[PDB]
Design a protein around this ligand. Sequence first.
Ligand SMILES: [Ca+2]
Length: 89
Amino acid sequence: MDDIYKAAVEQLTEEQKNEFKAAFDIFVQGAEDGSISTKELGKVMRMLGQNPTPEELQEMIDEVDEDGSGTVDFDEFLVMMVRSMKDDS
Ligand SMILES: [Ca+2]
């Protein structure tokens, strides 16, 4: 059910796990804990190379938010990044 996402992050190698940190540092450096809202998350996706629609981006960020804050952090972004791939590249 949900383990498919947890297994993807575990299967991902360390070099890939660090890639998310480099992109997230752009907004984490100018933040306290490193949490972004959906309105600013669109810029994070466009900057990383994502083209998700607005009606779909809400679910993309709301479904990964488990704590219920409405803001994607490093942990949530890691689970949202593997879903944005879907197939091979
Ligand atoms: Ca959150």
